[PDB]
Design a protein around this ligand. Structure first.
Ligand SMILES: NC(=O)c1ccc[n+]([C@@H]2O[C@H](COP(=O)([O-])OP(=O)(O)OC[C@H]3O[C@@H](n4cnc5c(N)ncnc54)[C@H](OP(=O)(O)O)[C@@H]3O)[C@@H](O)[C@H]2O)c1
Length: 316
């Protein structure tokens, strides 16, 4: 099923995550995105950062060309990268995304992060200490340029990602605001459930979309390998046995029952098909309370590389 966004458009509540690290061959994104659509995913999440929009777009268009779906059945997301926050670069950046995917529009365009970076060749310009070279950009001006992309029909809906409550309030309080963010895509899982940010988002009819809902890919660039493995959690395992599902399915269903839209990345055929089974069962109030009890303020993304950024959303 879908949730109705605050601009009247509809978003499927289960989304497929397409990010894989650069060591994974680019051709895999094509294969697995087709498999996801074939399994029943209709919401597909990409970004300029992922260097896979050519492949993800081809997977979508291939499933259109092969008769499986129409463009109107797919909900396709991309994101403005942080080197393009200056308002004059927003539309060009979006047009690159459209060119790569060979699509006329995205269903959703997000500001990927509030942590603006120096414009240039690199995705991630850093100094000699490894910290990313920041840019100072009024994100309200960035947002105005996002609104023009919606008016031009290049993005059906616009929203944000990795914003905390205050950063979000800055947008909502902007003089002359035309379109509220339809969503805030943020790290969200039983060890970092974001319930306060969720309550705030609910109060403004903004959808919280969860990433790393399965514990993240635990990439050594950003994630401490000593951090607890979400999917090995004894409570999630006990609930999996109770319901004859898996820890992953429990973690996904938890988000759906909280009114959270949830992403799920898998590049494995069997797990991709497993993940759509989230619609086949329910958790009880007691199950949900047990999962709510797991919250431990654990953001997996935890690196020096962004912890010193002025717009770093977390308070550590
Ligand atoms: N806006 C942002 O800053 C941002 C940040 C992070 C992520 N995202 C988006 O959200 C997506 C998902 O988040 P994520 O990349 O952190 O990964 P994730 O959804 O939390 O998944 C983590 C891992 O779980 C495994 N997995 C999936 N299904 C499973 C199952 N049924 N049983 C056991 N393991 C399973 C996957 O490995 P296998 O591939 O081997 O199955 C995957 O590597 C990303 O792909 C991206 O689209 C956005």
């Amino acid at each position: 099923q879908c949730v109705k966004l605050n601009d009247g458009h509809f978003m499927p509540v289960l989304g497929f995550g397409t990010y894989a690290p650069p060591e994974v061959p680019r051709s895999k994104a094509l294969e697995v995105t087709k498999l996801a659509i074939e399994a029943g995913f209709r919401h597909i999440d990409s970004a300029h950062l992922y260097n896979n929009e050519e492949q993800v777009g081809l997977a979508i268009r291939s499933k259109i060309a092969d008769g499986s779906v129409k463009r109107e059945d797919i909900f396709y997301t991309s994101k403005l990268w942080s080197t393009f926050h200056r308002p004059e670069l927003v539309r060009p950046a979006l047009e690159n995304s459209l060119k790569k995917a060979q699509l006329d529009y995205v269903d959703l365009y997000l500001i990927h992060s509030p942590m603006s970076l120096k414009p240039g060749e690199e995705l991630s310009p850093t100094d000699e200490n490894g910290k990313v070279i920041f840019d100072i950009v009024d994100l309200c001006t960035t947002w105005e340029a996002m609104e023009k992309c919606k008016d031009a029909g290049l993005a059906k809906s616009i929203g944000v990602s990795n914003f905390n409550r205050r950063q979000l309030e800055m947008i909502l309080n902007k003089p002359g605001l035309k379109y509220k963010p339809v969503c805030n895509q943020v790290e969200c899982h039983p060890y970092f459930n974001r319930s306060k940010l969720l309550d705030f988002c609910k109060s403004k009819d903004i959808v919280l979309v969860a990433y790393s809902a399965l514990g993240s890919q635990r990439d050594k660039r950003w994630v401490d390998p000593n951090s607890p493995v979400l999917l090995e959690d004894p409570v999630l395992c006990a609930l999996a046995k109770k319901h004859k599902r898996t820890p992953a399915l429990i973690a996904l269903r938890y988000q759906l029952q909280r009114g959270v839209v949830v992403l799920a990345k898998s590049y494995n055929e069997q797990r991709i098909r497993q993940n759509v089974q989230v619609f086949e069962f329910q958790l009880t109030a007691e199950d949900m309370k047990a999962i709510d009890g797991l919250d431990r303020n654990l953001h997996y993304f935890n690196s020096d590389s962004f912890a010193s950024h002025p717009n770093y959303p977390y308070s550590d």
